[PDB]
Design a protein around this ligand. Structure first.
Ligand SMILES: NC(=O)C1=CN([C@@H]2O[C@H](COP(=O)(O)OP(=O)(O)OC[C@H]3O[C@@H](n4cnc5c(N)ncnc54)[C@H](O)[C@@H]3O)[C@@H](O)[C@H]2O)C=CC1
Ligand SMILES: NC(=O)C1=CN([C@@H]2O[C@H](COP(=O)(O)OP(=O)(O)OC[C@H]3O[C@@H](n4cnc5c(N)ncnc54)[C@H](O)[C@@H]3O)[C@@H](O)[C@H]2O)C=CC1
Ligand SMILES: NC(=O)C1=CN([C@@H]2O[C@H](COP(=O)(O)OP(=O)(O)OC[C@H]3O[C@@H](n4cnc5c(N)ncnc54)[C@H](O)[C@@H]3O)[C@@H](O)[C@H]2O)C=CC1
Ligand SMILES: NC(=O)C1=CN([C@@H]2O[C@H](COP(=O)(O)OP(=O)(O)OC[C@H]3O[C@@H](n4cnc5c(N)ncnc54)[C@H](O)[C@@H]3O)[C@@H](O)[C@H]2O)C=CC1
Ligand SMILES: NC(=O)C1=CN([C@@H]2O[C@H](COP(=O)(O)OP(=O)(O)OC[C@H]3O[C@@H](n4cnc5c(N)ncnc54)[C@H](O)[C@@H]3O)[C@@H](O)[C@H]2O)C=CC1
Ligand SMILES: O=C(O)[C@@H]1CCCCO1
Ligand SMILES: O=C(O)[C@@H]1CCCCO1
Ligand SMILES: O=C(O)[C@@H]1CCCCO1
Ligand SMILES: O=C(O)[C@@H]1CCCCO1
Ligand SMILES: O=C(O)[C@@H]1CCCCO1
Lengths: 280, 281, 277, 277, 280
């Protein structure tokens, strides 16, 4: 529990809700010590945050004045407008944590430094399963972040899933893998359930079994010192059902499609930020 | 309370599934390792050495496993089931609950063999998966002709200690086999490939494996705790024009969904066709 | 009392005028349309409806309060040069042309008279049966009531909402081109019915009715389309077998490809226009 | 004065009862439905509407004049054995089950009482918004007014026409499964809109509205769908570029494949039913 | 001109209209010497026949009593019902010309011989372009057809396009090639017009040019003693536009698709008649 910590979210959408729900469920923050701002209070995420007890305001400057740790939870192209809006309000006490895909620490520090030297900036990439405290988060520390700042952020984000520090040049690739990853999983689970239904299962049972199979397999890999191929080898009996299914996955290039996905998400992330940097 | 039942459990077969279940049950605290006995004609297996390290009793004699057990799991390959039912069928007593885990093998085929000895063998058929080893298995079961209501309830309590467990009609179990039985292998293949994708884009392999596996675990847990359709959860990830919708497009262009349907179908059909051959023999 | 004009008397002018008059929001006699070819079938159909026709774009401007530009995109700069001197304070200029930016229209018109009131829309041919899908963006000098007037008018012939202009090229690829994807699909579904033994007329009727009803269900539902799809398919049944063969062909990706291709072509065409002017 | 019953209280029973009562042709209190599970969401929705619910299929039969069979196809022979002794001269039995033949129904019912009045229909879930597509065939003992009554009832919730029974499995693959093809397409079109920069909610709304309007245009047109498609595409323009990428993927063949697969699976399932009974 | 010839059609659909329009345009038959019967007088083809002056009746027996040459222009599965209906009305003077896809001379003669021995039967396969007198027709003579019967039928069908006698075992293959052929052409013309539209042509002009190109090329081949490949070689200049287009056709397996089509139509024709023969 961080007793003397006030957290704020600029943005009150999917990610702000996911993190606030994760933090409050973890018990590391009380909902009333969290403030979130948004120019649209008609979102289901805003309504959900209100029901949790999170303080809501339309004004980003109030979030800044309330907060010690300030999460930037707006879309990437909104970040430069946000930084110009509240840059004059950043104080020495603030840690600015940008969650926006692609947006570089350099770009954030350049904006904020025009108002006050030495802004404390941390960049993270996380994902929506923080809402069930099983997120995958990486973070990089900025130029003026103190050593305690990174440790504090790792303690906070570790309460809602895996968290580790990385060099910033890995983050766009992490975005393509674990940031976009849940969407690959949801697609796969929808299709696996369709497969169960084709073979005679009710949809509700097929969804439950497919999701439990994926969850269990992921946990096995996380808790094993063994290669995923070895775990795979343990399932298939010679001549059996599983090896027949694996063959039809291979024949469709299943592996290459997932490589294609991570690559496409990473490249698009890099492409979008390159355009943002050209606009500046 | 199941622990205070002091249940003796036996596995005919001492391979991957016997190890996974024994590890899950003992980690759950429902069984003492030394109250489990497993038999195999082959002790040189690595699964047998792991079982022995746990404290499970090991014997080459299937009759010893039967005499020890209260609940008896059949954990041999499907084509070996009729052979061991011939071998120990005379040793099944009225007190036994016989739980077949073998892919494809029907309750009817098991009861026909065992009913030649005692008239009312208590049979349950289940399908589970290796993640019971981390107590996150996906298990279904169907009760046989003579299984008492308390037998299915005991089975559900036991298997719920190592993951999800629900009763089904037997005619669903081959399809379950293709979905959640074979399922972990589809996931391991996907995680290997996702990690390769992370490596291609500049991540160290160890980090890419950790991140991909955490992403899959978290997404699966989200769906299990959500009332929303997976398509809606997917819609919540992807911003307009953004990284995720670009990646989803390349999955669609390869027929990603159809490949997973193909896999479930192929595993289910192979399960059915093997049992048809067995029924013909 | 509102008078409406169409520069251009082609497919879109016909569809909008038919929809407006069927809705009752405009009597045909309040509508004027112009074309340099008074021998088109659309021109004949408009005359039969009661619409006033002229070959002279200046006459349309002098008649109209709301002026729709319904010519091909590459013709827009030509007709703005022709009628720019005739725009007045009362005029609302509504460009329907694919890709053409408010900026490019206002730049041409402002050379003649400051503060042209411009709205850009993207619609589609189903306005002809009052089931169009329309979006609009307001220009620099459009009054607040200009947007509300246009939304009231276009809501009479289908869905209508205001958007930021930078969404319009994407809307073009989705609902602007969308009817053509549907007509292709309906032709193919009918071929499928014929292959399985249905007379062609019945197969066309059933396929179209199925698509209409499914689309209406989705519009009236809070549920995800995947959930509505799940409600159709019984385990092991006919529909899930058919869905598998669609998935195996990458059906979804083809529709994504189509929206993208129409949107990209729209952007590419306007970039070429901007290079010349 | 007509009383209606549903054996089965699932997706189809809900959709038809919602459509009938929205149309005004039936008050909810004239409808009874039965299911062995009174905890389904469809059962709760029917109770909220005013429909009478019972677990006992015999009670539904005793209440009803027109009796809809809305259980899964493999359940039909079981419930015909259960209620066959309770069919009376007044009853019209309307089977909605995919694949199940009039012959198989009449054979079961005639063991109890000669001359059962049987009609077989195929419909689809959009009856829930009164835009269904329904066909029906009359059985051996159905009176002439039985067919006209059923057409009046089912026309209240969509298109309805009489067919020969040997068309019904093909109709199942086209308009019965059809909504699922449309939901798949709408999900994908929305993904395409999102990829090109539209918010998901707007993309879903526009895609669905485009498909609805296009389908309505085809139903109100004498023109071939290819002609309507030709009217959308300007030379060199956005739509023809998008149509090319659909063609390059074999888009049309996938929809033919789907209708065929649903129809063949329907026939295959009924052949298996006929082998067992 | 066949002065003393009355022609009748059992069926008044697409083919009956196409042939009646072709014959009357050729001047070989006056429309009032043609009768057509149908159980549905609400067809556009029936209305078109009425406007031409063709006599219309609902009763197949009246068509038989009126006619000398009797065309069977109903769907193949209707043929056996037709033959049972009017078999007792066939006279010595009648030539029965079956146009139905797949239906064998043997099956027709077996039905009619139960009523009167020695029915004069001819089987043909034609196509819809007889309506513009450019049909492609083949015919086979039955067991009891006199030599003059085949010559008379060739004279009549040659007035509406190409006509030649074949052995009956070629007719199902002809069905897959020139019977179904117009539909392949209409598909190709629709697609070629789409190609013109993509490259900037108005649809009306693209349709006109595509159809004229196909017509001209077909006429060139019909009037040339040269192989289609040689005519093809004469169009393409080295390095030019045409050889570039031919390459993209080859890369898609264009040739194999047309082979697939003829095969699929022929096999389906054989399959359908095999089922008809099983039902008998
Ligand atoms: N959704 C996900 O799965 C994840 C998202 N992210 C990142 O989080 C950020 C937000 O993503 P979502 O929450 O999914 O977007 P979202 O669109 O659900 O929420 C965006 C929020 O920003 C608000 N907003 C717009 N203009 C604003 C302004 N001027 N001041 C304050 N708030 C404003 C919107 O009203 C909305 O509440 C993005 O940069 C994304 O890359 C990172 C990891 C995962
Ligand atoms: N491995 C998996 O992922 C799961 C396997 N299953 C089912 O569990 C059963 C066993 O599968 P695995 O354990 O993977 O096979 P495995 O091959 O690892 O172990 C098979 C065991 O049977 C033993 N055995 C062979 N003949 C025997 C005999 N006459 N008497 C006693 N033991 C004998 C072998 O020595 C070995 O110990 C199969 O029927 C499979 O379908 C079900 C769920 C998941
Ligand atoms: N057809 C559709 O599906 C929709 C079309 N649009 C847009 O509507 C506009 C027109 O589209 P269509 O009506 O389909 O084209 P169309 O070609 O049917 O009509 C074009 C009309 O402009 C006339 N025209 C040519 N030069 C002219 C001039 N100098 N002055 C006045 N009229 C002139 C032509 O004679 C013809 O009447 C295009 O910009 C298109 O992007 C937008 C929504 C959907
Ligand atoms: N869902 C659709 O899109 C359409 C379905 N159909 C046909 O309608 C029938 C039902 O389809 P759905 O409603 O989708 O299935 P559903 O599974 O939603 O409803 C089935 C209902 O039957 C009930 N039931 C099971 N055993 C019963 C018994 N012994 N007595 C009475 N009720 C019993 C179930 O509890 C459930 O209420 C099927 O034959 C299907 O082919 C036809 C047109 C479209
Ligand atoms: N349409 C084509 O391109 C060609 C068709 N054919 C053959 O010509 C025959 C007819 O083909 P279409 O004319 O295309 O079919 P169509 O369906 O246009 O005409 C069929 C006609 O038969 C009538 N009919 C149905 N039952 C009847 C009965 N009991 N007595 C009399 N008339 C009855 C129908 O009312 C309709 O007028 C088929 O056997 C087909 O294989 C052969 C060459 C080309
Ligand atoms: O491949 C196999 O034989 C096994 C069958 C049961 C589920 C796991 O795979
Ligand atoms: O697609 C998107 O905009 C986001 C980017 C961060 C990870 C989730 O996806
Ligand atoms: O897939 C199914 O079982 C149903 C059959 C009727 C039409 C809708 O689909
Ligand atoms: O293809 C075209 O030129 C038009 C653009 C507007 C939407 C309909 O298509
Ligand atoms: O291939 C070629 O170079 C020529 C060009 C004109 C049209 C015929 O082909």
């Amino acid at each position: 529990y961080f007793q003397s910590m006030s957290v704020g979210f600029i943005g009150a959408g999917q990610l702000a809700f996911a993190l606030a729900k994760g933090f409050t469920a973890a018990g590391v923050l009380a909902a009333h010590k969290i403030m979130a701002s948004s120019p649209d209070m008609d979102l289901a995420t805003v309504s959900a945050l209100r029901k949790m007890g999170v303080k809501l305001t339309p004004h980003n400057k109030e979030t800044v004045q309330h907060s010690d740790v300030l999460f930037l939870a707006v879309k990437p192209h909104i970040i430069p407008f946000i930084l110009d809006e509240i840059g004059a309000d950043i104080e020495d006490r603030h840690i600015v944590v940008s969650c926006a895909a692609g947006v570089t620490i350099s770009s954030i520090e350049k904006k904020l430094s025009a108002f006050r030297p030495a802004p404390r900036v941390i960049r993270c990439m996380t994902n929506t399963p923080v809402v069930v405290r099983e997120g995958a988060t990486v973070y990089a520390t900025g130029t003026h972040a103190q050593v305690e700042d990174g440790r504090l952020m790792e303690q906070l984000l570790s309460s809602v899933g895996f968290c580790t520090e990385v060099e910033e040049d890995l983050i766009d690739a992490v975005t393509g893998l674990s940031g976009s990853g849940p969407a690959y999983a949801f697609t796969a689970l929808d299709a696996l359930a369709d497969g169960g239904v084709k073979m005679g299962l009710p949809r509700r049972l097929a969804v439950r079994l497919g999701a439990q199979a994926l969850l269990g397999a992921a946990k096995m890999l996380l808790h094993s010192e063994q290669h995923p191929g070895q775990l795979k080898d343990n399932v298939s009996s010679p001549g059996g059902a599983t090896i027949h299914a694996l063959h039809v996955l291979e024949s469709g290039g299943f592996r290459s499609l997932l490589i294609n996905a991570v690559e496409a998400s990473c490249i698009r992330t890099r492409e979008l930020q390159s355009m943002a940097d050209q606009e500046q």
